[PDB]
Curated annotation (Swiss-Prot), chain D:
This is Cathelicidin-2. Exerts, in vitro, a potent antimicrobial activity. Probably due to an impairment of the function of the respiratory chain and of energy-dependent activities in the inner membrane of susceptible microorganisms. Large granules of neutrophils. BAC5 sequence consists almost exclusively of X-P-P-Y repeats.
Amino acid sequence: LWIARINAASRQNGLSYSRFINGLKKASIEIDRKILADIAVFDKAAFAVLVEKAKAAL
Amino acid sequence: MKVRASVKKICRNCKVIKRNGVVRVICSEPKHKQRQG
Amino acid sequence: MIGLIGRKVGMTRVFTEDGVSIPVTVVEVEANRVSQVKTLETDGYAAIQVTAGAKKANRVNKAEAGHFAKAGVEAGRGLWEFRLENGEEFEVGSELTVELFNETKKVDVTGTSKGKGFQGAVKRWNFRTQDMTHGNSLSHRAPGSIGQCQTPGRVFKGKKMAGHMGAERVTTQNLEIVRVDAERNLLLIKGAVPGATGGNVIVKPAVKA
Amino acid sequence: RFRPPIRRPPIRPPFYP
Amino acid sequence: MKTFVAKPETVKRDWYVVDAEGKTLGRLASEIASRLRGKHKAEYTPHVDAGDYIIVINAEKVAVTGNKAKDKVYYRHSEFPGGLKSITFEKLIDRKPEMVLELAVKGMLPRGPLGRAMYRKLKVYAGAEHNHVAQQPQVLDI
Amino acid sequence: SRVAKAPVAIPAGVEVKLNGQEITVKGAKGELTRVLNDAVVIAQEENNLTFGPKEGVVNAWAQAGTARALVNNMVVGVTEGFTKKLTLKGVGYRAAIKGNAVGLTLGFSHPVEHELPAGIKAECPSQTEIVITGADKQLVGQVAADIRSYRQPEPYKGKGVRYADENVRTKEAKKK
RNA sequence: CGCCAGCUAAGGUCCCAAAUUACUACUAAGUGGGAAACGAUGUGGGAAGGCUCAGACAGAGUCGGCCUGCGCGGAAGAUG
RNA sequence: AUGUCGGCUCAUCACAUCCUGGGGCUGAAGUCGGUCCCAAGGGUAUGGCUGUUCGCCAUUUAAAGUGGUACGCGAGCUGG
RNA sequence: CGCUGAAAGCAUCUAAGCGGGAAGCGAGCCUUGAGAUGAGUUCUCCCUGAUACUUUAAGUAUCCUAAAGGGUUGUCGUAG
Ligand SMILES: [Zn+2]
């Protein structure tokens, strides 16, 4: 469920789930899918930040 | 018409043609006409 | 096609001068009056609705009575609709008479068949009876098998069985008109017409002509 | 080939004891 | 603590309008199907219809590759013996334009109560017009 | 290929109107129009039309070749036009032009009458000869085919509607 | 054994159904997603050969083998 | 404890088509045929003998198809 | 079975394009049919009162009203 939600949010911010997780890994961000998916719902801006960080790492 | 798995020139005036995905022999000799090559 | 709404009066014969008897059903077409014109703009199809006969005023609902009042026809025994295909123009109140079929050689008649109630497969579907003697046990008018073992393990839909017979819309086709009587508002139609005497019949020019 | 079987008892219901 | 759940009461469903003209049936349908579920939203909850109303116009102009126009067959069984009915894509586009896309989407949606509910939100139209001006649908390139 | 690489001259008194992929050739004998395949590139170099393949398209040369020959037939059509000549053989077989229709007696109990299409014009030099003429080589061919189809030449006495050219292989009937 | 944490295996990543994009080819047969002998100017690649501007093949190429990729026909069953 | 042959009743499907429809070839003049291709919409004997299915016979018919369905159908009949 | 037509200077029903063509296929005929929950359309008819109360609703309660029409009852039917 989380992965599906994160994928939705990432793609709204112009990155695939698969690329976003790689990005975060490369950025050394170790936020779990449970939290990410919580952020994607409750703090859309923060999700976008994380996405921008992820994009930079890729 | 001869419907056969093996179609092939029976004489020198026979000519093989593919027409709508079927191999066919067509010839001046009506007996030589074939399909289902 | 335009048609009339008759009442089946009964059968009779018409002796021709050449000594042929003609079995005729007599349909009485009391003047039909257009009660509503349906158009493509209002209703999405072209039809006339017609009434026929009279209904006791007391027997007419307010909803019914307003519909007739709008046409400025008197209430009739029911309402029947005829699709128009020819771009034919009718107005409300316009009468249709037996004289419609003055040129028509053959008509198609439609009524409700007489009701035979619950009938078995033998009468309903012309099932053969089984043996009346020679051992038959309680299974003389029985319908037989109704299927075919494990495959398919069920009775197929539309299997001919006992059930209600009759009391159904039926149309006979290509019934000749023997005589139009405009005075008495009669059509004499060769042969049989669905349903019992007194039943409503719709008469229409034959579609297969 | 079809070998004619003996599937049922020789005395048939309702008498089958 | 608990993962968020979309609430049938609260879920915001947006109207969109898609032009089918010149679009690969299947590729179009897969996108529409995901939007009807609401897979495109972070609030995507499997047990809730948080999807979006999709209007499709020019459904009769939906495209198909290969010889699929003449060879794609739609089957229906009446449940009467020998009650199988076939129609080809081309013939179904003539008879009932809209069915082609609707069938496509229907297959791609989940089976059961909710999936039937999702499909209800698809409003397919053969022409270029639709009766849902009041819903103010946004154009969507899908 | 070869056929494409050969350009089509535009004789003086032919008014070719290229509309991208469409080519309305016009001339004395009429106005023929045709949209070529997208795969075909057409160009008007001088008083010649030149045919060649679109870049990257499979069977573009083949498409280019047909388009050449199509246009060529258009040009011949509007200047000279095409004529096909049917010949009737068989006792009591006769044709006669009645209006815009070739009436044929072909030994059928019903009377046979074939309405010429728009742009086609049939004559009857004799009762036993017909001449279908027009600008569109395909229409002409179609019409002569249709008329021939009423009673195609039998193989025992040759009887029926044949092309004046057509050679009708004649078998004799099985001995006895 | 518990956990609304993370990584992977086989298998996967259009939608049902969690997850992919880019690029290079080939296939047009829904091949993929049943079936052989054999048949066939289907089409892609490779390495040679014969014949030809002293004119080939039917005024420039053309013919036939070989090694190979992918396709075609051959291909009829019973409730849907 | 899944009743087993044949009949009767009632069927339903396949198509490898018996008839009827459309075709090609014919050693197809015509009238008929043969053979192959398309086609499963509808139609597709009654009797004599035998428990028979079958078969033979008589006389029909446009034709008297070939199969699958617990060699369809005994909580539907029969029981030779 | 073609017409026109290249690939393949020819040829070629086919690759682009345009035809003919079956008792079969979709309509056409008859019947059912909006539980077609996607529950359609049209025509006509009927109901235009008070109050309090609350955690204010498509609220509750009381009073007054009881329409169009539907039923039950009755005489019956070629309907059962
Ligand atoms: Zn030959």
